[PDB]
Design a protein around this ligand. Structure first.
Ligand SMILES: Nc1nc2c(ncn2[C@H]2C[C@H](O)[C@@H](COP(=O)(O)OP(=O)(O)OP(=O)(O)O)O2)c(=O)[nH]1
Ligand SMILES: [Mg+2]
Ligand SMILES: [Mg+2]
Ligand SMILES: [Mg+2]
Length: 539
DNA sequence: GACCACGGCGCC
DNA sequence: AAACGGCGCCGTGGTC
């Protein structure tokens, strides 16, 4: 290309280099742009940011987040990663995308700009006549990228002092548990080392090894296995409790307070838009889509996520989402009628399986039932259903029997989905998002049947993901008008921040936007709550 | 110090 | 072991 002075013209493709991957923490090392046979390099990249009307190019969202951190409204536009990801969701990194579609991902802003221009041209070529993928790009993925940039840059308020205090107390309890483990072992060891634990449990003590590890074939010490040995030694109980405490302490309690950004005062995740095989988002650096919720300590941790003073959190979660999506995709008359009557399958399974009235069904129980409903649907074995439910074998075969043909056309849709996948090489969501599943005609049954369960899950998980993304796209400008913020997405859930005076209005409107995003043959329902913290906002 | 594979486990 | 699906992070044991 011709080297031309900085500033590029309207609509050039950007390239940039960050000191590190996290846009909120990164130094912008270099910036450049490409257009009309010219390349333009910024002499000082922070100043040069102000010249651009949009970030158009590879990883556009990340540059926009960094721009927003600097008080600049620089929205992300076209991004070839999104085109590639829609062509094939195994396109997840610029390294792979570059090499597949006609360049090389280097460490020089100018080359990255030139690469972005030609990859766009090429990937746009590959999408000619792909009307549905084009619809998803223009109506979902491209505008979603601007919403995620705003979410990332806003971050969430964390109660830091509280988490520090909690750490000091959890440490004393951890030392009580490990002292007693060491007393039962007859000696100390590194209890965090699963290899050392293996030796202690199965070689030194008498315990039977009920399982091997996948890749290396060691005797397993997972909670599944240790559940089996709960009565067979007291020590196991102590280990499981230690595991829980150390997991929560090392993953959330200790790292999160150290991630508060000094300028914003807030905690900033990244929402990765080309990371999953199904069209879902992921969250990283720190993952805020797996904050504990389940155990009493998990609940304590979740209370650390709070509203700014004068604001409240609003938490919205889709009811029974993939079950509703299934009703629509399959067209099953019985499953449709179940949601038309306002039934709750999760509560009904809990009630059945624990043998209590619905009124007594607690959150712990509801989660257990989810495992069963989604397990069975997505091809769980009779054997593994027996384990889990803790019941005989032929009963599980009959349960899986009872589950299907209660909903006869689910099976017919599973079969239809697999034959299209075998013939075309890919399966698709309601909106035409594709996933290529190559192993459907594999000759090794295990490899074939795993490919099958991945294949028929994707249209269901992926359609739910499509719906949520579209709701976000529709909701965001409505929130801006009302002076509220979108903070987090957790697959079928949004967490917003609203000024106290507008909180109820905001909750009502977001609920409606989420429920009416794309009408199906069953109603979507959204549970919404409002509170000072994330836990209290879902009660 | 970075990177890796693995087991294990938090959430959806 | 259990072969529901989709993720990312931790502490290991280990290499370079
Ligand atoms: N295959 C599978 N999918 C799951 C599992 N847990 C959650 N999901 C998927 C399916 C759910 O519909 C979706 C949203 O998770 P939620 O915790 O919100 O469950 P759901 O919305 O169905 O129930 P809810 O009515 O919100 O309590 O994520 C699981 O254990 N297996
Ligand atoms: Mg839900
Ligand atoms: Mg949810
Ligand atoms: Mg792994």
């Amino acid at each position: 290309l011709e080297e031309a002075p900085w500033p590029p013209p309207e609509g050039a493709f950007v390239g940039f280099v960050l000191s590190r991957k996290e846009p909120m923490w990164a130094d912008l090392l270099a910036l450049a742009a490409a257009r009309g046979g010219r390349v333009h390099r910024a002499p000082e990249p922070y100043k040069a940011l102000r010249d651009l009307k949009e970030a158009r190019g590879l990883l556009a969202k990340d540059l926009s987040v960094l721009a927003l951190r600097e008080g600049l409204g620089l929205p992300p536009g076209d991004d070839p990663m999104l085109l590639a990801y829609l062509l094939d969701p195994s396109n997840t990194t610029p390294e792979g995308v570059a090499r597949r579609y006609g360049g090389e991902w280097t460490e020089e802003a100018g080359e990255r700009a030139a690469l972005s221009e030609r990859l766009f041209a090429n990937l746009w070529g590959r999408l000619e006549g792909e009307e549905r993928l084009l619809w998803l790009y223009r109506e979902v993925e491209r505008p979603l990228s601007a919403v995620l940039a705003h979410m990332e840059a806003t971050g969430v308020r964390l109660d830091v002092a509280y988490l520090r205090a909690l750490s000091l107390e959890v440490a004393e309890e951890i030392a009580r548990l490990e002292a007693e483990v060491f007393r039962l072992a007859g000696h100390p060891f590194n209890l965090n080392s699963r290899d050392q634990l293996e030796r202690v449990l199965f070689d030194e003590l008498g315990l039977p090894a009920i399982g091997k590890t996948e890749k290396t074939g060691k005797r397993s010490t997972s909670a599944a296995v240790l559940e089996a040995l709960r009565e067979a030694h007291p020590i196991v109980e102590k280990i499981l409790q230690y595991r829980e405490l150390t997991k929560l302490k090392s993953t959330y309690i200790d790292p999160l307070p150290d991630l508060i950004h000094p300028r914003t005062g807030r905690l900033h995740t990244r929402f990765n838009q080309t990371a999953t095989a199904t069209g879902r988002l992921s969250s990283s650096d720190p993952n805020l889509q797996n904050i504990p919720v389940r155990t009493p300590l998990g609940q304590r941790i979740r209370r650390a996520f709070i509203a700014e003073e004068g604001w409240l959190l609003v938490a919205l979660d889709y009811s029974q989402i993939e079950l509703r999506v299934l009703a629509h995709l399959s067209g099953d008359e019985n499953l449709i009628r179940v949601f038309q009557e306002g039934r709750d399958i999760h509560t009904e399974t809990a009630s059945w399986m624990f043998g209590v009235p619905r009124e007594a069904v607690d959150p712990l129980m509801r989660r257990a039932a989810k495992t069963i409903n989604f397990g069975v649907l997505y091809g769980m074995s009779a054997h593994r259903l027996s384990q889990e439910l803790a019941i005989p074998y032929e009963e599980a075969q009959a349960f899986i029997e009872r589950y299907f043909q209660s909903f006869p056309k689910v099976r017919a849709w599973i079969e239809k989905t697999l034959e299209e996948g075998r013939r075309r090489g890919y399966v698709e969501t309601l909106f035409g998002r594709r996933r290529y599943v190559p192993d459907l005609e594999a000759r090794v049954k295990s490899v074939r049947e795993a490919a099958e369960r991945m294949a028929f899950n994707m249209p269901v998980q992926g359609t739910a993901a499509d719906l949520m993304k579209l709701a976000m796209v529709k909701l965001f400008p409505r929130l801006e008008e009302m002076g509220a913020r979108m903070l987090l997405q957790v697959h079928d859930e949004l967490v917003l921040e609203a000024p106290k005076e507008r909180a109820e209005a905001v909750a009502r409107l977001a609920k409606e936007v989420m429920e009416g995003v794309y009408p199906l043959a069953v109603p979507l329902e959204v549970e919404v709550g409002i509170g000072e913290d994330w836990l209290s906002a879902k009660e």
